[PDB]
């Protein structure tokens, strides 16, 4: 049983930007989702060993989680907001791939994803 290396959160050769939308995504969107009662399963990479889900990383080849996204934001890892939004979408999509409609984990993702879409519907305009 082995978890893979988690996604990178630092990369000096990546071009980085401190964007008004990216600050919003950390200060407002991520930190609001982070406090939700259903956020805890998404706050770190899936530990397929602890959770005894040995087939998780057989199926999920681009893992993502809100703890990785929080580190990426706090270390100024993104060039623009769409890169950060795509990591959220990967995280939600992975959960819907590995799991089935009706699963408790999928009810949690569906709630988080609707809040997430509410919060990003309006981003501060690129000043
Ligand atoms: C989001 C990443 N991710 C999955 O794809 C997934 C599949 C099955 C279980 C599980 C758990 S759990 O065992 O802690 N638990 C959490 C609360 C609701 C259910 O009871 C399951 C935590 C995080 C998970 C899973």
Curated annotation (Swiss-Prot):
Residues of the site described as Acetylated histone binding: 99
Protein origin, superkingdom: Eukaryota
Linked residues for Glycyl lysine isopeptide (Lys-Gly) (interchain with G-Cter in SUMO2): 58
Residue ranges of every copy of the Bromo domain listed in the record: 17-123
Subcellular location: Nucleus; Chromosome
Note: JQ1, a thieno-triazolo-1,4-diazepine derivative, and I-BET, a benzodiazepine derivative, have been tested on tumors with success. Treatment with GSK1210151A (I-BET151, a I-BET derivative) has strong effets on mixed lineage leukemia and promotes myeloid differentiation and leukemia stem-cell depletion.
Functional summary from the UniProt entry: Chromatin reader protein that recognizes and binds acetylated histones and plays a key role in transmission of epigenetic memory across cell divisions and transcription regulation. Remains associated with acetylated chromatin throughout the entire cell cycle and provides epigenetic memory for postmitotic G1 gene transcription by preserving acetylated chromatin status and maintaining high-order chromatin structure. During interphase, plays a key role in regulating the transcription of signal-inducible genes by associating with the P-TEFb complex and recruiting it to promoters.
Assembly and binders: Interacts with p53/TP53; the interaction is direct. Interacts (via CTD region) with CDK9 and CCNT1, acting as an associated component of P-TEFb complex. Interacts with RELA (when acetylated at 'Lys-310'). Interacts (via NET domain) with NSD3, CHD4, BICRA and ATAD5. The interaction with BICRA bridges BRD4 to the GBAF complex. Interacts (via NET domain) with JMJD6 (via JmjC and N-terminal domains); the interaction is stronger in presence of ssRNA and recruits JMJD6 on distal enhancers. Interacts with NSD3. Interacts with NIPBL.
Domain notes: The NET domain mediates interaction with a number of chromatin proteins involved in transcription regulation (NSD3, JMJD6, CHD4, GLTSCR1 and ATAD5).
Protein name: Bromodomain-containing protein 4
Source species: Homo sapiens
